[PDB]
């Protein structure tokens, strides 16, 4: 049995394993253990012999605002800074990214709003992507925080968006807006709904999916994915291992945490 | 004309600002003679009303909220006194507790949005003002909000509050206040000044509005009018430490240094009344005129009348 999370739930409907991020008031920001819980949920979908599709849905106006940096500038159990950051960043990132890389069921993502950070990195590893309207974007803010690529974006961002686009958006910290997503065929359908109701959007996506899978041999879908994955599996594994160990030096240096401290240090001069 | 909150990136930072520090728990006091006075809440209320010291009212509410941690009004009044006592973290903590018990309190939402603005968490203040609106005028706000890449959060909520202000047949204040706060965070202080001066003509017997006028002015480099509004606020309430601190800051800004050291001694003496917060500003005002005799005597365990002379009251 898998434990319970007040921020991520799931269910099984026919051949669909549906994952739901249900913390809309913090913009679905996830901590380390929430990323490890996603990894576990994907490992749980991967072993059900009745599941063929794995569907990741969200709630609110954001898909996910990224990692949870709440309480990171607080000053207040590790013998060094390297050991601390190994345990608190490298393990989580390597684990959840590899869980997404090797998934054997078809991964579908329903974008109800923007995605940021490691969550956008995980969006760009899903196989099919649906958007609610044309106000969605992906933001990888690594140069502003003092970090480098995460979640296999080294391989997936140039693969799905282009090399020149990726350079212009990552070197200068810009978003992958919706028209860039539509020029590269990133989004498979735009449901064009009001951005206020993500529940109706999620329900509509599931209904349309149920219509599409009528009459197909589904083992065939799983075999075709097994073969289509073998194109870039080695690139992704190599990038995973290299990224999580190259970003450790940026954490240990001390720039990300310094920038975090001077982010939340804007007290005003006079009062009221 | 709005895309989302966080405005197509470029507001991701400034959304992390309101989160990285976390939440601090309320830091109680060790010598609180009201630890078991079953009238401690009553005593706190009567201290708040009778113009007594604010530190003592704060202690009484400490007791009342350590006797029954569900008395929402006790948390509310503790936050109210702690923010006018110039303790923003204790005030924010108390008001957060109150709002978490009573998620539809109005004055808690308002005072907490003002404190957030003071600390620089502008987006949390925006959400709190949105929530105050939709819990105060739910139907009007609900049909305002359903009308649905150029506009950011501040402008969006300013337009919403403007339209809310027009869709009612009065000019009832506490809506002009929030308009002033939105403009204030935008850094166009003259709209804020107009709003606060208008909210005072409808009730010029306020102290918080005079202090907010003082702050809005002093941000715009009108230090003389700032001094005058602080003096007004203090005339209406001599226990108001927020106003003394602001007064001293702007005095230091305009070369008045003996008065400012007197004001900081007075603030450190209004905090230290049980039988404290930033001292660095006192060090700065002493380094301005450079008197080593008092410069080198910095201590959170010292005397204040020991600072006789020019520093003396």
Numbering used by the authors:
A (entry chain A): 4 to 79, 85 to 280
B (entry chain G): 276 to 423, 433 to 559, 575 to 612
Paper text:
A prominent example is peroxisomal matrix proteins, most of which depend on the targeting factor Pex5 to localize and function correctly. One such example is the yeast Eci1 (Δ3, Δ2-enoyl-CoA isomerase 1), an enzyme that is essential for the β-oxidation of unsaturated fatty acids in peroxisomes. Although Eci1 contains a PTS1, its targeting to peroxisomes can occur independently of this signal. Using cryo-electron microscopy (cryo-EM), we resolved the structure of the Pex5–Eci1 complex, revealing a novel binding interface in addition to the PTS1-binding interface.
To gain molecular insight, we focused on the subset where Pex5 and the Eci1–Pex5 interface was most stable, containing only a single Eci1 subunit bound to Pex5. The maps from this subset were refined to 2.7 Å (1 Å=0.1 nm) globally, whereas Pex5 and the interface were resolved to 2.9 Å after local refinement of this region. Interestingly, there was electron density for an additional 21 residues at the Pex5 N-terminal region (276LVNDDLNLGEDYLKYLGGRVN296), which we name the Eci1-binding interface (EBI). This interface had not been observed previously in any other known Pex5 structures. Cryo-EM maps of the Pex5–Eci1 complex, containing the full-length Pex5, did not show electron density for the N-terminal domain (NTD) of Pex5 (up to residue E275). The first involves the C-terminal segment (268FRQLGSKQRKHRL280) of one out of the six Eci1 subunits, which includes the PTS1 (278HRL280) and interacted with the TPR3, TPR6 and TPR7 domains of Pex5. The PTS1-containing segment was located within a deep central cavity of the TPR domain and was reinforced by a network of hydrogen bonds formed between 278HRL280 and residues in TPR3, TPR6 and TPR7 of Pex5. Our structural analysis revealed a previously unidentified binding interface – the EBI, consisting of an elongated stretch of 21 mostly variable residues in the NTD of Pex5 (276LVNDDLNLGEDYLKYLGGRVN296). This stretch interacted with a distinct interface on Eci1, as well as with a few residues from the C-segment of Eci1 (F268, L271, and G272), suggesting that the EBI and the PTS1-binding regions work together to facilitate the interaction between Pex5 and Eci1.
